[PDB]
Design a protein around this nucleic acid. Structure first.
Ligand SMILES: [Cl-]
Ligand SMILES: [Cl-]
Ligand SMILES: [Cl-]
Ligand SMILES: [Cl-]
Ligand SMILES: [Cl-]
Ligand SMILES: [Cl-]
Ligand SMILES: [K+]
Ligand SMILES: [Mg+2]
Ligand SMILES: [Mg+2]
Ligand SMILES: [Mg+2]
Ligand SMILES: [Mg+2]
Ligand SMILES: [Mg+2]
Ligand SMILES: [Mg+2]
Ligand SMILES: [Mg+2]
Ligand SMILES: [Mg+2]
Ligand SMILES: [Mg+2]
Ligand SMILES: [Mg+2]
Ligand SMILES: [Mg+2]
Ligand SMILES: [Mg+2]
Ligand SMILES: [Mg+2]
Ligand SMILES: [Mg+2]
Ligand SMILES: [Mg+2]
Ligand SMILES: [Mg+2]
Ligand SMILES: [Mg+2]
Ligand SMILES: [Mg+2]
Ligand SMILES: [Mg+2]
Ligand SMILES: [Mg+2]
Ligand SMILES: [Mg+2]
Ligand SMILES: [Mg+2]
Ligand SMILES: [Mg+2]
Ligand SMILES: [Mg+2]
Ligand SMILES: [Mg+2]
Ligand SMILES: [Mg+2]
Ligand SMILES: [Mg+2]
Ligand SMILES: [Mg+2]
Ligand SMILES: [Mg+2]
Ligand code: NA
Ligand code: NA
Ligand code: NA
Ligand code: NA
Ligand code: NA
Ligand code: NA
Ligand code: NA
Ligand code: NA
Ligand code: NA
Ligand code: NA
Ligand code: NA
Ligand code: NA
Ligand code: NA
Ligand code: NA
Ligand code: NA
Ligand code: NA
Ligand code: NA
Ligand code: NA
Ligand code: NA
Ligand code: NA
Ligand code: NA
Ligand code: NA
Ligand code: NA
Ligand code: NA
Lengths: 154, 186, 92, 156, 95
RNA sequence: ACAGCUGGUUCCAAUCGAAACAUGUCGAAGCAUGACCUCCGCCGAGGUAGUCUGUGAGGUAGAGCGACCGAUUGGUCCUGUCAAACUCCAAACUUACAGACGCCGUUUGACGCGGGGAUUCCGGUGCGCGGGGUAAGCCUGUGUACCAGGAGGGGAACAACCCAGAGAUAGGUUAAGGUCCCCAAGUGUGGAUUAAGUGUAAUCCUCUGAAGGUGG
RNA sequence: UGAGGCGCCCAAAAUGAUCGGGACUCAAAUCCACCACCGAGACCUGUCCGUACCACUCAUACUGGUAAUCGAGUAGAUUGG
RNA sequence: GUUUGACUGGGGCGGUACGCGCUCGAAAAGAUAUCGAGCGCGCCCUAUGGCUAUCUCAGCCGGGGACCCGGCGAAGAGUGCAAGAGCAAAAGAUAGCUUGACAGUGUUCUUCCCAACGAGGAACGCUGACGCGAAAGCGUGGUCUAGCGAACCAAUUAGCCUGCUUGAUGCGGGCAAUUGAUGACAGAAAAGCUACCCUAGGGAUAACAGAGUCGUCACUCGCAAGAGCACAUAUCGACCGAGUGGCUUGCUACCUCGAUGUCGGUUCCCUCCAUCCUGCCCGUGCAGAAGCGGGCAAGGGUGAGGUUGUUCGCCUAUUA
RNA sequence: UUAGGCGGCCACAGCGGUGGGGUUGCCUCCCGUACCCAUCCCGAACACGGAAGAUAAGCCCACCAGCGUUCCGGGGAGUACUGGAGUGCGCGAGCCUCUGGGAAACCCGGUUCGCCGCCACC
């Protein structure tokens, strides 16, 4: 399972690429979604490769971001351990996190918005004109790499 | 053979066995084919249908297994062909086959030929087949009369030992008569 | 091109094939009593006569076949589509 | 006319003589020079390598070749060496010589398309590289910057 | 296009590779399809008759009855519904 | 008088939101019919902008031609070259249909049907692919995104280059870009090169600088 | 003797020279790395408004709820004032 | 009284890209422009149509560029005509027979991708009547894509409907269809001049100036064949190659058509350097004198006249 | 399939070559022209009638790779080309990096001298 964050805007981006992000529930910059590692999903992320940051996050990081930026399908309600326990199959954020990571369920299945609306990266990211292997922030990241980004956008 | 661009004919065209232009036309009817084939000594008749991996023969008769019913004469003649046709035709009927189109392969549509005798036989067996009566022999020749008379110009038996000296178109009737009722494999 | 004067073909009247005879349609003479003839006389006056002041169109490079097919037994003819032919000569 | 007009390979390949007439003859005199009776049975083999894809008019080929071979006469008219220009001017070139109306040009010449890194010239010499000099003069009359390369020759 | 006939720009699609040259095998010209079956359309260069407009080469339609020995195949050209009259010699069962 | 031509046509707000193209036209400064925009009524459960897989379509790039074809070297088999109107080969990719996932629709009725009303048929630019042309801030295609009709931030200024698509108001963090002063933020750190004020100039009509040369 | 980096020569134009300007040389240049910051109406966040939809309703009057998947716009269509 | 068309790197002349077919352009689905490249069609054929039988071709080899025999020979032959495609017990050749190149009426595709639009075209049926074949079957003209034409009117084909109170006759009107042309080819019946001109507009479009370009023009550089009595480089300097300028010319059509006053001259001001003189220098095929060539350099100077409107240029006498 | 007939895929099956096989199931060559039928001339062929002979052709069986073809390993080659992205480089032509794909020639070594279906049959 990979974490998807749009880092580049819609202006001037191919339409077929924009619709792809939209099918992955991201409609704004800094919006994140969690995607299972399947053939179907893999092709989609490859197509979006140049306007996004993605990678497999650590259990911890996912928990921090889930707690901090997860939302119900509808409403303000904070998604904390109690919420998770009183609304999902799991007993706490950690349990949900693990299930997501092991691709056993999805944010929607558990009554949560498929989108984690992140905050801009505190300290700024590495740039949206170059990929990771060049010092930029676009493309596939290290688990440590994704974690840094996700945590700076916590 | 000569290179990458060289065109090699379909196998059965190489073997000079199948006329594909005639085959297509034959298959147009959507009906089973009455395959009439000859050999120096025998005459074969098959009712073939189309299949996913090749033709399917649903019924057949060979001039050899004619003796199996009382044939004691040569098997490469007119009376032989007719009977083989009738025999295959009967087996055809038993198999639930009601109609067919005559496929004479690479043979020639010569009037009174053996392939047409085969066709006559199959039709009398009950098989409905597109035909033309005045392209068939005049019964007597089918019976084998032309050969009996030929032996009349004897001086030396037309048949080396075989059966009879003056031959028998009567043996023909006895057999046809036989095939038209009961008996095994029919 | 060449064309047989007589040949077997379908007769739409007899409703069966029969020998027909082919002939080029000879123009019929006008009587000068048709409506258009009366309109020409009526409407022509002082000045331009509108449509009646126009003159003979022109010619296409090759004309189409203009024939009559006459049944040899019932004597009734029929018409057919023509085809472009620079020249049409009958055989016999 | 300047090479500026034809040195680039931005146009479609235009070489079908069955649809093109009035093509000027080539000015290139020979392609095999020196001892063409003998085969490359020499110790040293130097090559003139083009460093950029370009079009070389038969004009430049001839002047480049002449300037090189005419000089290789530091070895003599019947000297022991063989010189080869491996390219031929296949590309037909036009000129629109009305303004931009019906501008498809008329045939005015031919050029050879050389890709960066190909060798246009190859000489065969015994340890007597006067050929290295014949080429300093040759890449002097062709558009691109060039690399003088020696292959069989560890006799440095 | 310099012209607008049906065969404009069909040099490749209506030409056989040198080895597939020559009368085609009759088996596929007699194949039978049922209404509802999905068939791929592809003209066989060697078979003159039963063809369809070259623009439809590559389409995959639905057999929906027949006319004479030819089949009536329904396709969708862009957004438009069309019916194509075509013989078995130029059709293949999908899957 | 008529004009298919120029000018003008007066209050507020909310929703959707183009076309600068195709066919016909004494037609190209105009129309009509389609495309496309919008509104209304009807239908009632699927739909398909993305990806994956399966079943099909294809001869462009490339390559090659002791595979056709036609070009194109030399020597007494060898040796030197090519193709928009060549192909023994052959992609990426585009594309028909189907399934799967995604997204979407069943009170927001999709897909589709019928009807009312248009506007529009001078377009432009960037990028990729082009064809013509010595070239052009050239002409003419094509796919796409943008300007047109697109604010705000950056780029000295500057329709289409970068960030960015925007209700009001307020706090905060970033993007492009930038941190010596003008000017918000570093006269930041480790190391190296350059002595020409090279340079302090992504892109560009716009920022030149070449072949050739250099014991700097 | 092979290769690489930066610079130099090649290098001529018309009112007043230029990198936006000042001006800069172990840089305020260039290349390899790195650290911390500044900086939009973007993103996050409080309140309000409009529009659409939902619940209740006679109501398009209130009240409550939903919008990550609503909020730019020439020609033009529609509608309230 | 009117007409005298459109397209078009302004318009005119030229051309027709004004109706059609093929290859390429066209970016491996489909669609796709230019006064884009190559080139065709406005017919011809009673067989050069249709079917059946018999048969296999170019070319080369061997034996007696005609003919005869054998062998190799998937196709290079032939198939009416462009181009591309198809075809070998055939779609080609030979022979024979035949008139389906038939009447009627449709389905569908095309014309017009997508996506509406006529004529025309094609594919595939049916009904009727036929041809050939043993038969399956083939024949809706030619193997496939060009060879085409509205309404009104006339002529023609077969039967029927109909014309004002009514009957007879004459002569009309109509249903279905064939033929006659509009090539500006989805169809007007159609020549020019205007500097005597007029109006509406356009910088949607030309002349002039500007702007972009730089083939042309001007100037430079690289290489240095060559000659220069010997000697490339005192001097001259080809070929080929790389550039700079924006003075000429051409191209483009961005700017202005509710106007940016023309050429040449003149007068008056500033500037550029690729320097003609002057200053300071280098080389010399530099004895001197007089030169030739080159470098730095734009301070100053660069004048008067004869022909021509001339710019330019030719000519005269002066001049550093 | 101790030899046959009709085929499907249509060179992995072609081209060329070696060896083996028949009082019989058989197929052939073969023998022969009164008939059906036949040669623009020939019972050559086509057609018909038939077994004295043969396994030499064909055919069937087993096998050979020199040519042609199919597929595979390793090398060429993750090269050539290419869908997406970049305030990366270059006067420019053009190049480079990241991401997703990915060839052709040719060389060397294997494979391939058909596979499969229905029917009939010591
Ligand atoms: Cl047989
Ligand atoms: Cl006539
Ligand atoms: Cl069709
Ligand atoms: Cl927007
Ligand atoms: Cl300075
Ligand atoms: Cl209001
Ligand atoms: K003006
Ligand atoms: Mg929400
Ligand atoms: Mg900050
Ligand atoms: Mg940044
Ligand atoms: Mg009059
Ligand atoms: Mg308003
Ligand atoms: Mg309002
Ligand atoms: Mg093509
Ligand atoms: Mg190529
Ligand atoms: Mg394409
Ligand atoms: Mg506008
Ligand atoms: Mg400050
Ligand atoms: Mg500078
Ligand atoms: Mg640049
Ligand atoms: Mg709005
Ligand atoms: Mg008047
Ligand atoms: Mg007049
Ligand atoms: Mg005009
Ligand atoms: Mg295409
Ligand atoms: Mg035909
Ligand atoms: Mg008229
Ligand atoms: Mg007439
Ligand atoms: Mg017209
Ligand atoms: Mg038209
Ligand atoms: Mg006026
Ligand atoms: Mg203008
Ligand atoms: Mg003024
Ligand atoms: Mg100077
Ligand atoms: Mg001065
Ligand atoms: Mg043997
Ligand atoms: Na009157
Ligand atoms: Na002209
Ligand atoms: Na050079
Ligand atoms: Na074929
Ligand atoms: Na008027
Ligand atoms: Na337009
Ligand atoms: Na128009
Ligand atoms: Na107008
Ligand atoms: Na779905
Ligand atoms: Na390319
Ligand atoms: Na926009
Ligand atoms: Na700005
Ligand atoms: Na400077
Ligand atoms: Na509006
Ligand atoms: Na006119
Ligand atoms: Na039509
Ligand atoms: Na100019
Ligand atoms: Na210049
Ligand atoms: Na004005
Ligand atoms: Na003046
Ligand atoms: Na001076
Ligand atoms: Na004078
Ligand atoms: Na004769
Ligand atoms: Na044998």
């Amino acid at each position: 399972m990979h974490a998807l964050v749009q880092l580049r805007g819609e202006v001037n981006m191919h339409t077929d690429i924009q619709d792809t992000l939209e099918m992955l529930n991201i409609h704004h910059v800094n919006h994140c979604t969690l995607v299972p590692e399947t053939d179907a999903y893999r092709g989609m992320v490859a197509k979006v490769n140049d306007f996004v940051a993605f990678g497999e996050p650590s259990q911890e990081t996912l928990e921090t971001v889930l707690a901090t930026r997860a939302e119900p399908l509808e409403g303000d309600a904070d998604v904390d351990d109690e919420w998770v326990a009183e609304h999902t199959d799991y007993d706490d954020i950690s349990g949900l996190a693990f299930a997501l990571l092991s691709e056993e369920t999805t944010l929607r299945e558990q009554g949560l918005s498929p989108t984690l609306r992140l905050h801009p990266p505190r300290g700024g990211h590495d740039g949206v004109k170059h990929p990771v292997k060049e010092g930029g922030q676009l493309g596939k990241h290290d688990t440590e790499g994704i974690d840094d980004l996700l945590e700076a956008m916590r | 053979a000569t290179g990458p661009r060289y065109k090699v004919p379909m196998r059965r065209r190489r073997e000079a066995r199948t006329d594909y232009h005639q085959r297509l036309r034959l298959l147009k009817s959507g009906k089973p084919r009455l395959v009439a084939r000859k050999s120096n000594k025998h005459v074969r008749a098959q009712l073939v249908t189309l299949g996913p991996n090749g033709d399917d023969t649903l019924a057949s008769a060979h001039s050899s297994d004619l003796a199996e019913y009382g044939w004691e004469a040569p098997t490469g003649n007119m009376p032989s062909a007719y009977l083989t046709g009738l025999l295959a035709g009967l087996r055809a009927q038993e198999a639930g086959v009601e109609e067919a189109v005559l496929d004479i392969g690479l043979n020639s549509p010569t009037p009174g030929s053996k392939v047409f005798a085969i066709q006559e036989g199959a039709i009398d067996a009950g098989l409905d087949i597109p035909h033309n009566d005045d392209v068939l022999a005049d019964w007597q020749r089918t019976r084998g009369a032309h050969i009996a008379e030929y032996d009349e110009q004897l001086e030396e038996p037309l048949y080396s030992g075989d059966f009879d000296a003056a031959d028998l178109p009567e043996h023909f009737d006895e057999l046809r008569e036989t095939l038209l009722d009961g008996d095994i494999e029919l | 091109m060449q064309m047989p004067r007589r040949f077997n073909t379908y007769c739409p009247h007899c409703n069966e094939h029969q020998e027909h005879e082919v002939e080029k349609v000879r123009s019929g003479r006008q009587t000068g009593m048709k409506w258009i003839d009366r309109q020409r006389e009526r409407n022509s006056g002082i000045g331009n006569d509108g449509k009646f002041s126009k003159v003979p169109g022109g010619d296409k490079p090759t004309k189409k076949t203009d024939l009559k097919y006459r049944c040899g037994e019932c004597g009734k003819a029929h018409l057919r589509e023509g085809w472009r032919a620079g020249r049409l000569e009958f055989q016999e | 006319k300047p090479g500026a007009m034809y040195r680039n390979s931005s146009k479609p390949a235009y070489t079908r003589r069955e649809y093109i007439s009035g093509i000027p003859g080539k000015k290139i005199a020979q392609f095999d020079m020196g001892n063409n009776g003998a085969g490359p049975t020499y110790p040293a083999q130097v090559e003139l390598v083009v460093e950029k894809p370009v079009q070389i008019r038969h004009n430049a080929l001839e002047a480049a070749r002449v300037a090189a071979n005419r000089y290789v006469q530091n070895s003599g008219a019947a000297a022991n060496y063989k010189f080869r220009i491996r390219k031929f001017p296949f590309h037909v070139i036009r000129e629109n010589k009305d303004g931009m109306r019906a501008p498809f040009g008329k045939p005015v010449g031919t050029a050879a398309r050389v890709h960066g890194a190909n060798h246009i010239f190859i000489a065969w010499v015994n340890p007597d590289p006067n050929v290295e000099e014949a080429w300093r003069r040759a890449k002097m009359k062709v558009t691109p910057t060039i690399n003088i390369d020696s292959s069989p020759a560890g006799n440095a | 296009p310099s012209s607008n006939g049906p065969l404009e720009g069909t040099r490749g699609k209506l030409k056989n590779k040198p080895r597939d040259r020559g009368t085609s095998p009759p088996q596929r010209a007699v194949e039978e399809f049922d209404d509802g079956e999905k068939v791929h359309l592809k003209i066989d260069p060697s078979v003159p008759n039963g063809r369809f407009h070259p623009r439809f080469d590559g389409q995959t339609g639905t057999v929906e009855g027949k006319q004479g020995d030819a089949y009536k195949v329904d396709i969708v050209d862009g957004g438009k519904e069309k019916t194509i009259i075509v013989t078995a010699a130029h059709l293949r069962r999908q899957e």
